[PDB]
Design a protein around this ligand. Structure first.
Ligand SMILES: O=C(NCc1ccc(S(=O)(=O)c2cccc(C(F)(F)F)c2)cc1)c1cnc2c(cnn2[C@@H]2O[C@H](COP(=O)(O)O)[C@@H](O)[C@H]2O)c1
Ligand SMILES: O=C(NCc1ccc(S(=O)(=O)c2cccc(C(F)(F)F)c2)cc1)c1cnc2c(cnn2[C@@H]2O[C@H](COP(=O)(O)O)[C@@H](O)[C@H]2O)c1
Lengths: 471, 470
């Protein structure tokens, strides 16, 4: 079972002794700090953390004792604040006297803005605010996955629109392949749910249960997949029987979309000689609702996509669309699912456009590049204290290192507002109380053990929409 | 609750219809594929996965029904192998008819060797072997962290030994700061546990409980920490009261080691004026078992460290050790806990050596660099089918993409052996049975729902030791 008393950075155990005496309030905020591109971030993931780790009775007699025992050995000393945790147990039945205010989930906010704030609601628990910093800062992950996934949707939108005149099938152009490429089962579910804010194609099943449990959708499931082969299901037939493998598989899944990895021995021979000659008759007969999706899985991503397309282009009736780009027959498509990140995704669709191929032909699968190859410093996610009350007086606090202006933090009580031009502004020093900037966009989502405002996964998807999808 | 029927990549759900008819055996293996850095990998993490996810009754009527309903919507079709999973439930009480053989945890193994193998023990369950690829492949992570952590230890060991003549305090030179910088709670523990194979300093509490539950140590805890400050505990005193903050903190922890971040406003001012003049009397009076550890947290990592050392070197009695390198008084140390990855760690210790500062002076804290900035392709961790039986006939299978020789997989039944020079070799095509290379070094660690071999965290630590340590 999970223990909130053991879910923090070790040194935070010793912090209650280091704040100024007579400190009754510690007020902290979280932001994706601006750097001197990712100019806007999707806010997603907090509601999961709140429901799974912060709400309800999170303190017990056994959990306090368990932590006391651990820290005594961990520190070789009794620095653990048993008193403070026992106070919460007895006064509030184990509920955290904490208030958290957050921008609605799905919201797209420019860098350098307050996304959420945290503060204690009982003066005895001044220390509790930054106790849970560590657990709250982990929200950087689903935020970063949702943001990076969405930036990739922008690229796909731009090229699909230019080469086809519309955005049909956009939400199925970037599929989640990274279940095996993430660090854990929990990360897999969280990361998969963040990708599904923007797209509908996933193979990371874990994300489905997370969304159903913490967010919910009107639809039965938020994400989908279709039958496909792996190297083991092709190679098991032995080297000389790749054709038999292919034939058995496309026949097994004759009436649904099927993807078949074709690079086990020679991708270019498979497309030209097996798919384009030997088994061609099994391809041109397929429904538009059940195409064959050819999957290369090695070589330079751009070059392999181009060459495969040129091969299929010569073995199949290729048409040209209204925009002037080449289009494969409806029963035949390609998915590039190896070495795809936001950088290579751009290189590929750009290269395809150069060679007059429509982005309608291609879908992408992304594993590590989607769910693992991200860090907290990509969006500069940071949780800092901006305001404290000591001796009844509230002072605005902040850091401002001489050698790095970028690491400077915000002063005092904060609020997020719409500017007159429809953009976003974060007001500092409690200036939001002057009410010259309309209503705070930060809503109370957590207070005293209770989740006070929730959003469904449908609302989040609506909020995270692209402008081009709106227009 | 965890459901293994939902713990795989979607397309693997459709795979039982794709193998050649009358397949009775699927046999697969895991290696850190070959490619001048990361030539050897620490095998760590499988035992966690085995216990938490694979052992015992992992199949129930309820998990089967739940999986059935999810996949019907997820595929918009009925493709889920309800029959196969029901067979496992009824024939083995939910225990996986699987055998897994693996190298001992902690073992350091050169790239391109079989680390573990998996095969089904029941013909009916040919499809099971690669169902669990996804969960087993996630062992890449603890493997990679343990490896990258150990490679950094080799770097620290070289420079500590060179500048101080010994390896005292090596296992406390790289501290785990990665709790907030990882993707989840589970990942935090796994990653922190992996780091603790090589070092003893961690701030990721979650790693301790995991080790105790899945590995176990003779000692009460496998990792340690000391009190320290954060920007919030300094800045809360207000800009004009940084001196007061520092003084309160060092006095609160006057008999234990304490680290204080000094870069909130002006790192070089705090080292020269506050620590070096105003509060100097509270530092020189501290015990060797309770030093102040100054912590910069901004600027160029190498440049900041050098300037800080030169500032402290001029305000404090500096000595010269037996190797001729400068050394702070024993009550005063430094920790660099910002911007530390394996690359910058090397840049800092080497730059320090060039300025004649001992590595005794410094410790490193690493967050994202240690536990997050890693991927599966760093060691090329891969799981592939090498052997199948169809119609009673054994076939040595493999992939070999024309456009990438590096992705070529191994053929047939595998085994791991010592060479006559005492190095590792992986034998293919069942050639291990010829007995020309001695006995297979892999051990059956999992068979039919039961863990059959496991290793204490103490034995893993022993196995992962550096050569210079031995
Ligand atoms: O084909 C796969 N899954 C089925 C599949 C089939 C077709 C599509 S699609 O063409 O987008 C499509 C079409 C129609 C409808 C849908 C819809 F969605 F509507 F149903 C989706 C999408 C998924 C597949 C294929 N390969 C996969 C994985 C997961 N891991 N890997 C492998 O592991 C690596 C992980 O990547 P990395 O970490 O190295 O970067 C990848 O490269 C692969 O080798 C999944
Ligand atoms: O000071 C901290 N912890 C206490 C602490 C103090 C001193 C040491 S030590 O000097 O190694 C030492 C000395 C004696 C005994 C031990 C022993 F071990 F025996 F007890 C350890 C070891 C730990 C500390 C300080 N900062 C921390 C964290 C966790 N996260 N962060 C922040 O996270 C970022 C990580 O960077 P990034 O890579 O994610 O970008 C940093 O910038 C920090 O702001 C912990």
């Amino acid at each position: 079972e999970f223990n909130i008393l053991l879910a923090t950075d070790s040194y935070k155990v010793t912090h209650y002794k280091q704040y100024p005496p007579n400190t009754s309030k510690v007020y902290s905020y979280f932001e994706c700090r601006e750097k001197k591109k990712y100019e806007e971030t999707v806010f997603y993931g907090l509601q999961y953390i709140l429901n799974k780790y912060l709400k309800g009775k999170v303190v017990t007699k056994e959990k306090i004792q368990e932590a006391k025992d651990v820290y005594k050995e961990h520190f070789q000393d009794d620095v653990f604040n048993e008193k403070g945790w026992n106070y919460i147990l007895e006064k509030y039945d184990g509920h955290l006297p904490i208030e958290i205010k957050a921008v609605p989930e799905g919201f797209v906010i420019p860098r350098g803005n307050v996304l959420f704030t945290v503060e204690n609601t009982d003066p005895e628990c001044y220390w509790l605010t930054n106790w849970i910093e560590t657990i709250l800062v982990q929200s950087w992950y689903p935020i970063t996955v949702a943001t990076n996934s969405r930036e990739q949707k922008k690229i796909l939108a731009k090229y699909l629109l230019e080469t086809s005149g519309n955005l049909d099938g956009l939400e199925y152009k970037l599929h989640d392949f990274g279940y095996r490429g993430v660090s854990s089962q929990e990360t897999a579910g969280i990361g998969a749910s963040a990708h599904l804010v923007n797209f509908k194609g996933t193979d990371t099943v874990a994300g489905l249960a997370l969304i159903k449990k913490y967010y919910g959708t009107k639809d039965p499931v938020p994400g989908y997949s279709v039958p496909a082969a792996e190297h083991s299901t092709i190679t098991a037939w032995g080297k000389d029987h790749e054709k038999d493998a292919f034939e058995h598989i496309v026949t097994q899944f004759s009436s649904v979309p099927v993807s078949v990895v074709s690079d086990s021995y020679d991708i270019y021979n498979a497309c030209e000689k097996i798919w384009g000659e030997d088994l061609r008759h099994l391809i041109v007969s397929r429904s538009t609702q059940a195409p064959l999706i050819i999957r290369p899985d090695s070589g330079n991503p751009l070059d392999t996509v181009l060459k495969v397309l040129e091969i299929l282009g010569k073995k199949f009736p290729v048409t040209e669309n209204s925009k002037g780009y080449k289009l494969l027959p409806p029963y035949l498509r390609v998915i590039q699912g190896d070495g795809v990140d936001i950088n290579t995704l751009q290189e590929i669709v750009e290269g395809m456009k150069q060679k007059m191929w429509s982005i309608e032909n291609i879908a992408f699968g992304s594993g590590g590049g989607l769910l693992q190859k991200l860090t907290r410093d990509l969006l500069n996610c940071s949780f800092k204290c901006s305001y404290v009350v000591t001796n009844g007086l509230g002072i605005n606090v902040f850091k401002d290192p001489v050698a790095d202006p970028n690491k400077r933090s915000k002063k005092g009580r904060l609020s997020l507002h719409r500017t007159p031009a429809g953009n976003f502004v974060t007001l500092e020093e409690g200036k939001g109380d002057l009410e010259e900037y309309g209503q705070d966009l930060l809503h109370t989502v957590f207070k005293n053990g209770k989740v006070t405002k929730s959003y469904s996964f449908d609302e989040i998807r609506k909020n995270a929409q692209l402008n081009i999808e709106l227009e």
